[PDB]
Amino acid sequence: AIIKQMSRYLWPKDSWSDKARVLLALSLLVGGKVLNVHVPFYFREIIDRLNIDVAAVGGTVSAVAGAVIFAYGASRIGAVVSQELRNAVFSSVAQKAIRRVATQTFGHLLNLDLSFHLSKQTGGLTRAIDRGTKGISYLLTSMVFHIVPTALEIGMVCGILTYQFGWEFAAITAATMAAYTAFTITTTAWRTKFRRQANAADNAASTVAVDSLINYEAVKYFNNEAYEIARYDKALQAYERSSIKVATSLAFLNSGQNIIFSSALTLMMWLGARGVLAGDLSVGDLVLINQLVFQLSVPLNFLGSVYRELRQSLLDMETLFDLQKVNVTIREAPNAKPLALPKGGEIRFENVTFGYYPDRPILRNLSLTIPAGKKVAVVGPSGCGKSTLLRLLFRSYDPQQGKIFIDDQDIKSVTLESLRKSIGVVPQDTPLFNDTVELNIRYGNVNATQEQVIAAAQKAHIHEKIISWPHGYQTRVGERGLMISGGEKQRLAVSRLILKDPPLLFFDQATSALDTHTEQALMANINEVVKEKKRTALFVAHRLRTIYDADLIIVLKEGVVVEQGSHRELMERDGVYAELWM
Amino acid sequence: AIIKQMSRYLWPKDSWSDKARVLLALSLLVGGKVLNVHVPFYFREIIDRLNIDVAAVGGTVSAVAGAVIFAYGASRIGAVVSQELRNAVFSSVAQKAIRRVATQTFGHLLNLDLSFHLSKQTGGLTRAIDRGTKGISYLLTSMVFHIVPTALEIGMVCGILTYQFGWEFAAITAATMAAYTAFTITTTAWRTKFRRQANAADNAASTVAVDSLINYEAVKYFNNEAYEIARYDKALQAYERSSIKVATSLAFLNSGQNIIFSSALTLMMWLGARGVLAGDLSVGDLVLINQLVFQLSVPLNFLGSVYRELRQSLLDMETLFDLQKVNVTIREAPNAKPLALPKGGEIRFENVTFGYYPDRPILRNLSLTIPAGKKVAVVGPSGCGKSTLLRLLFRSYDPQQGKIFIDDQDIKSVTLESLRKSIGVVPQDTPLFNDTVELNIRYGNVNATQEQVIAAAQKAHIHEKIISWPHGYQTRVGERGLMISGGEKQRLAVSRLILKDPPLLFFDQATSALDTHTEQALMANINEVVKEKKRTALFVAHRLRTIYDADLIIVLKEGVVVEQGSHRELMERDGVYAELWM
Ligand SMILES: N[C@@H](CCC(=O)N[C@@H](CS)C(=O)NCC(=O)O)C(=O)O
Ligand SMILES: N[C@@H](CCC(=O)N[C@@H](CS)C(=O)NCC(=O)O)C(=O)O
C-alpha cells in the first residue's frame, strides 16, 4: 500500500508552473497551520491582558488589548483562507495529472491487441480508467488536504505543549491522536462492509423494480401484481436493514470520536487547573491548551471518510496500474521497413498454420498467391476459418506457423503504421460512431474536406439517402441516431474505403445479410467502384452465388486450399444455387 | 417548495413505535442542544473559579473546580452522544417511511395502464421511484439532522446572549447567521451549476472512451488511433476545466463562510473586552461568548451541502409525486360483477371500432361470435390490427365504439381481477424473468408445488431440455441466464398457461418466428394440450398455412370481418402456399 504512495509521490512534478504552484500549495499549507496555531495564543493574550484588576490602568480596549483582538481575527481568517487557497491551488495540479494519466492509459489500451480486447468487456476497462484516475486524484487531493496537514498540526501542537507546559500535555495529546486514529480506522474498516451492503441491496431492489416494469404485460397477464409488490418489499426490507445499520454505526463512530477528544480536553483541563493552582500557569493558558487540542479536533473530524475513500482509491488505482502493464503481443520488429508496399500488390501465404487456441488449429499449412489488380475471392464452408485471413494479414494476430509476404517482404518486418495504412477493410458488420454521418464517412481520412465526403457519398449512392435524412448529412446517426439499414452501413464502409484510398482492398463477408436485391445492388456498386479503379481487391464470402463472376477464385476446405481457378472449373463442385431448398 | 414540506411533515406518524421513537428523537434533539450550550457555561465556570488569586484558599483541584471540569467533559460527551442517538433513532423512521412510500408508488405504477407504460421508458419510472424516495429520505433526515437543530441552537444562543450580555450580542449573532446563510445559499446556488457541469462533461469523456473501445476493430482498421486519443483529450480537458472551477468555488465558499464567523467572533470579542474593562463582564464571559458563537459554527459548516441536496430532493420528490397522481384510464364499473364467466365461453364483438390514436381507426365496426370449446383462428394482412383483439378483450384498452360480451355480459361491468384470471395468454414474444426456469414456469400460479411445474414441463416437452440444462430446472435463466431458443420460450409460455388453468385461451401470433419444423412441432404440442382439454381457444396468426386445419376460421380485411367459415370456403381466397416465392 506504500509502494503506490511512493510512485504517485514521485510522478507529479517536472513542469515549471506545476512545480511553482505545488510550492505555493506547500507554502500555504505551512503558513495556514502556523496561523492556525497562533489563534489560541492570541486568545490567551486577550484573556491575560484583560485579567488585570480594573483598579489598574483600565482605559479603552484599544490601549489594553486591541492589537491581540485584531490578531485573533486575522489569525482565524488567514488560517482558513490559507486552507482554501492551498486546496484551490493544488486542485489544478491534481486535475492536470489525472488528465495526462488517463490519456496515457487510453493510448496504451488502444495500442494493445485483439486477444486482450476480446478477452475483457470494454465497459470494465473504461470504468477501470475512470475509477483509477479518480483514485489518483483522491490520493493527491487527500494527501495534501487531510493526511499531511493534520499530521503537521499534530506535530506542532505536541511541540508547543511541550515547550510551554511539559511532556505531560504532549503525551496526552499524542496518546489521544493514537487512540482516536486506532479507533476511527478500526470502526471505519468495520463500517464500510455495512456501507457496501447497503449499496448492494439497493441495486438489488432497483433491478427488481426494473425487471417487474420491463415485464409489465407479463405481470398483468398472470394477475400476480401482489407477488411483485411483495418481492419489492423484501428487497427494500433488506435495504432498510442495511441502511439502519449504516446510520447506527455512523452514530457509534461519531460518538466514540468525540468521547476521545472530550476525555483528552478534560484531562488537560485538569492538569491546567493543577498548573494554575500551583502558580505555574495562568488562567489564559487554560484556553490555550483547550483551544490547541480542540483545533486539532477540526481536521480529524473526517478521518473516517478520508480513510474509506483513500483505501478505495488504493484499490482502484491498483486495477488501473494493472492495465498499465499488460503487454504488446504483436510488436513490430526493431527498425521495421515500410518497403515493398508500393509494388504490384501480391499477397503470398507460405505454409501458414494459424488457429484460435493453438491446441485447435483452424487454418492449417496454407500457401497461396494473390497477384496485383485482381478481383480474387475465397470461398469455403461455414466455420472453416476464412475470416482469420484478414485478421492474419492485417497483423491483428500472428501466424503460429508459416509466413506472410506482401510483394516480397515479411509482415513481421514491415512497419505497422504504414502496413495498416496500405490495407483497407470493409468488415462483415461495420459499427457506426454515435456521431454525424459526415464524420462516419470522414473516418476514412480525418484531414478531408467536405467535397471528398460528398464524392464518397456519390460513388456508392449515399448522397440520395443523406439528402433523405432530416438535417442533410449533418444528421446525428448511431445507436442513438436514426435506425438505419445494413446496406447503407456497408455503403458507409465503402465510402470510408474511398476516402482512405488504399492500395489493398478487402471485403470480408461484406454481403452477409438477409435479402438479395439490396445485396446485389451493393455488390454492383462496389464492383464499379473497385474494379476500374486499379487496386488489388480480396473478397471473402461463403455465399459464392454472389461472387461467382469474380476474376480469380480460391476455395478452402477444413483449413487447406483445395481448388484454385475460374468459375467453370469450380462448377464441378458446388456453386450452383442448389442450396436454396428452404 | 413549502407545500412538499407540509405534505411530508404530515405523513410520517400514525404508528405507535414510530411515534414513540420520533418522540425519543425530538427529546434527544432538545437535550442535545441543551447539553451543547452548557459546555461554554461550564468553561466559563472553570475559568472563573481558577481566576481567584492563589493567595486565597488555593488547595486541590477537586475542591476548587472539579465539579465543573467533570461537568464540562460530561456536557461535551452528552451533547454529541445525543446528536448521534437522535440520528440513529430517526433513521429508522426515515427508512420505514421510504419503504412504504416506494411500495405504494410501485403498486400504483403496476395498477396504471398500457398507454402509460408504452409512453414512458421503464428505466425512467424506476429511477423516478428510487430518486424520489431517496429525496424523501433526505428531506426527513435533513429536517431532523441539520435544518431544525441548528435553528433551535441559533435561537437558544441569541436568547442566552440576550439574557446575559444584552441585545448587542444577540443582534451580532443574528446578523451573522443572516449573512452567513444568505452568502452560503447564494454561493451554493451559483456553485451547483459548476458541479453539474463537471458531472456532465465527465460522462461525456467516459462515453467517448466507451465508443472508442466498442469500435476497436474499426479504429484499428483505419489507423487513426491518435484521433481517438485527441478526442479523449478534449473531453477530459473540458472535465478538468469544470473540476478546477468546482474546487475553486468550494474554496471561495469555505473561506467566505469562515470570514463571516471570524468577523462575528472578533466583534463579540471586542464588545466582551469593553464589558470587561467597564467592569460589567468577567474574563470567563469572553470564553462564554466566543464558545457559544463558535459552537454555532459547527453545524452550519454543512449549510452548503444540506441545501444543495435538499433542493435536489425537492426536485426529485416532485417527479415522484407527479407519478403518484397520474390516473386510472381503464377502471372497472362500481360494484362490478364476476358473473357470466363460468359459462360456455363465447365472445361476441358488437359493432366494435377501436384504433390507436382515434383519428386513425385501425379496427372498424366489427361484430363476431366465438362459441364454446372451439379452436377458432383469425387471419388477415399485415398491420390490419388483429393484435388489438387480445388487447381489446383483456381490457388492456377500451373499445372506442362497440361493445364486448363474454357469455352475455359487458366487459366494462365485469370485475377486472376475475376477468384477467379467466383469460390466459400466449404472447407473440414472451419475455422471461431473470430467474430460474422453475419460477418462469411457476409464474402461471405462484402457489404451486414442484410437481405441477414438472407436469407443465412434461405436457409441452420442456422436461428433456431442462434436464439438458446444467443445474436441472434450477438453472438460472433470463437475459443473463443461458441464451435459449424462441420455441422453448413459447414452451415456457404454454407451461405458464397450463399452470394457470384458465377457461379462455389465446395464442396471439404464437408462431411468429423464422423456421417451420420447430414451429410445426410446437403447433402440434399446443394442439394436443389445448384441444382434448375442453377449453375455448382463439389462435391469432397472419400465417394461415400454419392454422389452416383449425376448427373455425374468420378473416379480417382492413378492419372489417369479411369471410367466416371452414378451410375449403377460405380456399377461394389465399391460403395456398403461393406466398413462398422467395
Ligand atoms: N466525522 C465522521 C464522518 C464525517 C463524514 O463522513 N461526512 C461526510 C463525508 S466528508 C459524510 O456524510 N460521509 C458519509 C458517511 O461517512 O457515512 C467520521 O469521523 O467518520
Ligand atoms: N463546509 C462546506 C461544505 C462542507 C462539505 O459539504 N463537505 C463534504 C461532506 S458534507 C461534501 O459533501 N463536499 C462536497 C462539496 O461541497 O463539494 C460548505 O459550507 O458548503
JSON list of C-alpha atoms in Angstrom, two decimals, chain A residues 12-85:
[
{"chain": "A", "resi": 12, "resn": "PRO", "atom": "CA", "xyz": [3.59, 14.74, -10.17]},
{"chain": "A", "resi": 13, "resn": "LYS", "atom": "CA", "xyz": [6.46, 17.17, -10.91]},
{"chain": "A", "resi": 14, "resn": "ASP", "atom": "CA", "xyz": [8.69, 18.15, -13.87]},
{"chain": "A", "resi": 15, "resn": "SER", "atom": "CA", "xyz": [6.76, 21.12, -15.28]},
{"chain": "A", "resi": 16, "resn": "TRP", "atom": "CA", "xyz": [7.59, 24.65, -14.22]},
{"chain": "A", "resi": 17, "resn": "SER", "atom": "CA", "xyz": [4.16, 26.12, -13.50]},
{"chain": "A", "resi": 18, "resn": "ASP", "atom": "CA", "xyz": [3.23, 22.78, -11.93]},
{"chain": "A", "resi": 19, "resn": "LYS", "atom": "CA", "xyz": [6.17, 22.92, -9.54]},
{"chain": "A", "resi": 20, "resn": "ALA", "atom": "CA", "xyz": [5.54, 26.62, -8.95]},
{"chain": "A", "resi": 21, "resn": "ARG", "atom": "CA", "xyz": [2.01, 26.06, -7.77]},
{"chain": "A", "resi": 22, "resn": "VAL", "atom": "CA", "xyz": [2.92, 22.98, -5.75]},
{"chain": "A", "resi": 23, "resn": "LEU", "atom": "CA", "xyz": [5.47, 25.18, -3.98]},
{"chain": "A", "resi": 24, "resn": "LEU", "atom": "CA", "xyz": [2.68, 27.69, -3.42]},
{"chain": "A", "resi": 25, "resn": "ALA", "atom": "CA", "xyz": [0.42, 24.92, -2.11]},
{"chain": "A", "resi": 26, "resn": "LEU", "atom": "CA", "xyz": [3.07, 23.76, 0.37]},
{"chain": "A", "resi": 27, "resn": "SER", "atom": "CA", "xyz": [3.83, 27.33, 1.42]},
{"chain": "A", "resi": 28, "resn": "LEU", "atom": "CA", "xyz": [0.16, 27.95, 2.13]},
{"chain": "A", "resi": 29, "resn": "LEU", "atom": "CA", "xyz": [-0.05, 24.62, 3.97]},
{"chain": "A", "resi": 30, "resn": "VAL", "atom": "CA", "xyz": [2.69, 25.60, 6.42]},
{"chain": "A", "resi": 31, "resn": "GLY", "atom": "CA", "xyz": [1.52, 29.20, 6.69]},
{"chain": "A", "resi": 32, "resn": "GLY", "atom": "CA", "xyz": [-2.01, 28.01, 7.32]},
{"chain": "A", "resi": 33, "resn": "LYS", "atom": "CA", "xyz": [-1.00, 25.72, 10.14]},
{"chain": "A", "resi": 34, "resn": "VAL", "atom": "CA", "xyz": [1.15, 28.48, 11.67]},
{"chain": "A", "resi": 35, "resn": "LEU", "atom": "CA", "xyz": [-1.70, 30.99, 11.53]},
{"chain": "A", "resi": 36, "resn": "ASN", "atom": "CA", "xyz": [-3.97, 28.28, 12.89]},
{"chain": "A", "resi": 37, "resn": "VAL", "atom": "CA", "xyz": [-1.88, 27.62, 15.95]},
{"chain": "A", "resi": 38, "resn": "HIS", "atom": "CA", "xyz": [-1.49, 31.34, 16.59]},
{"chain": "A", "resi": 39, "resn": "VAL", "atom": "CA", "xyz": [-5.25, 31.63, 17.24]},
{"chain": "A", "resi": 40, "resn": "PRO", "atom": "CA", "xyz": [-5.16, 30.08, 20.75]},
{"chain": "A", "resi": 41, "resn": "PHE", "atom": "CA", "xyz": [-2.09, 32.13, 21.62]},
{"chain": "A", "resi": 42, "resn": "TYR", "atom": "CA", "xyz": [-3.82, 35.38, 20.74]},
{"chain": "A", "resi": 43, "resn": "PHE", "atom": "CA", "xyz": [-6.84, 34.15, 22.67]},
{"chain": "A", "resi": 44, "resn": "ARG", "atom": "CA", "xyz": [-4.53, 33.57, 25.62]},
{"chain": "A", "resi": 45, "resn": "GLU", "atom": "CA", "xyz": [-3.25, 37.12, 25.23]},
{"chain": "A", "resi": 46, "resn": "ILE", "atom": "CA", "xyz": [-6.76, 38.59, 25.09]},
{"chain": "A", "resi": 47, "resn": "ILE", "atom": "CA", "xyz": [-7.70, 36.66, 28.23]},
{"chain": "A", "resi": 48, "resn": "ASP", "atom": "CA", "xyz": [-4.48, 37.50, 30.07]},
{"chain": "A", "resi": 49, "resn": "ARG", "atom": "CA", "xyz": [-4.47, 41.19, 29.18]},
{"chain": "A", "resi": 50, "resn": "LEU", "atom": "CA", "xyz": [-7.98, 41.78, 30.50]},
{"chain": "A", "resi": 51, "resn": "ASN", "atom": "CA", "xyz": [-7.34, 39.70, 33.63]},
{"chain": "A", "resi": 52, "resn": "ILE", "atom": "CA", "xyz": [-5.63, 42.67, 35.27]},
{"chain": "A", "resi": 53, "resn": "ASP", "atom": "CA", "xyz": [-7.52, 44.25, 38.15]},
{"chain": "A", "resi": 54, "resn": "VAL", "atom": "CA", "xyz": [-9.61, 47.11, 36.80]},
{"chain": "A", "resi": 55, "resn": "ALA", "atom": "CA", "xyz": [-8.21, 49.25, 39.63]},
{"chain": "A", "resi": 56, "resn": "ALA", "atom": "CA", "xyz": [-5.09, 49.22, 37.43]},
{"chain": "A", "resi": 57, "resn": "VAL", "atom": "CA", "xyz": [-4.62, 51.23, 34.21]},
{"chain": "A", "resi": 58, "resn": "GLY", "atom": "CA", "xyz": [-8.02, 50.35, 32.71]},
{"chain": "A", "resi": 59, "resn": "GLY", "atom": "CA", "xyz": [-8.89, 52.64, 29.84]},
{"chain": "A", "resi": 60, "resn": "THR", "atom": "CA", "xyz": [-10.01, 51.88, 26.32]},
{"chain": "A", "resi": 61, "resn": "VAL", "atom": "CA", "xyz": [-9.95, 48.45, 24.70]},
{"chain": "A", "resi": 62, "resn": "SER", "atom": "CA", "xyz": [-7.63, 49.83, 22.02]},
{"chain": "A", "resi": 63, "resn": "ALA", "atom": "CA", "xyz": [-4.97, 50.59, 24.62]},
{"chain": "A", "resi": 64, "resn": "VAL", "atom": "CA", "xyz": [-5.32, 47.42, 26.69]},
{"chain": "A", "resi": 65, "resn": "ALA", "atom": "CA", "xyz": [-5.94, 44.72, 24.10]},
{"chain": "A", "resi": 66, "resn": "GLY", "atom": "CA", "xyz": [-6.86, 45.78, 20.59]},
{"chain": "A", "resi": 67, "resn": "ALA", "atom": "CA", "xyz": [-3.79, 44.50, 18.82]},
{"chain": "A", "resi": 68, "resn": "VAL", "atom": "CA", "xyz": [-4.39, 40.97, 20.04]},
{"chain": "A", "resi": 69, "resn": "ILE", "atom": "CA", "xyz": [-8.12, 41.08, 19.30]},
{"chain": "A", "resi": 70, "resn": "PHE", "atom": "CA", "xyz": [-7.41, 42.10, 15.70]},
{"chain": "A", "resi": 71, "resn": "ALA", "atom": "CA", "xyz": [-4.68, 39.48, 15.63]},
{"chain": "A", "resi": 72, "resn": "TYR", "atom": "CA", "xyz": [-7.14, 36.82, 16.80]},
{"chain": "A", "resi": 73, "resn": "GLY", "atom": "CA", "xyz": [-9.48, 37.79, 13.98]},
{"chain": "A", "resi": 74, "resn": "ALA", "atom": "CA", "xyz": [-6.70, 37.93, 11.41]},
{"chain": "A", "resi": 75, "resn": "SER", "atom": "CA", "xyz": [-5.24, 34.61, 12.52]},
{"chain": "A", "resi": 76, "resn": "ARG", "atom": "CA", "xyz": [-8.62, 32.86, 12.21]},
{"chain": "A", "resi": 77, "resn": "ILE", "atom": "CA", "xyz": [-9.34, 34.40, 8.79]},
{"chain": "A", "resi": 78, "resn": "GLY", "atom": "CA", "xyz": [-5.83, 33.76, 7.50]},
{"chain": "A", "resi": 79, "resn": "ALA", "atom": "CA", "xyz": [-5.72, 30.22, 8.83]},
{"chain": "A", "resi": 80, "resn": "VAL", "atom": "CA", "xyz": [-8.83, 29.29, 6.88]},
{"chain": "A", "resi": 81, "resn": "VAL", "atom": "CA", "xyz": [-8.08, 31.33, 3.76]},
{"chain": "A", "resi": 82, "resn": "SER", "atom": "CA", "xyz": [-4.72, 29.54, 3.58]},
{"chain": "A", "resi": 83, "resn": "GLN", "atom": "CA", "xyz": [-6.55, 26.21, 3.77]},
{"chain": "A", "resi": 84, "resn": "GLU", "atom": "CA", "xyz": [-8.90, 27.18, 0.99]},
{"chain": "A", "resi": 85, "resn": "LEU", "atom": "CA", "xyz": [-6.12, 28.62, -1.14]}
]
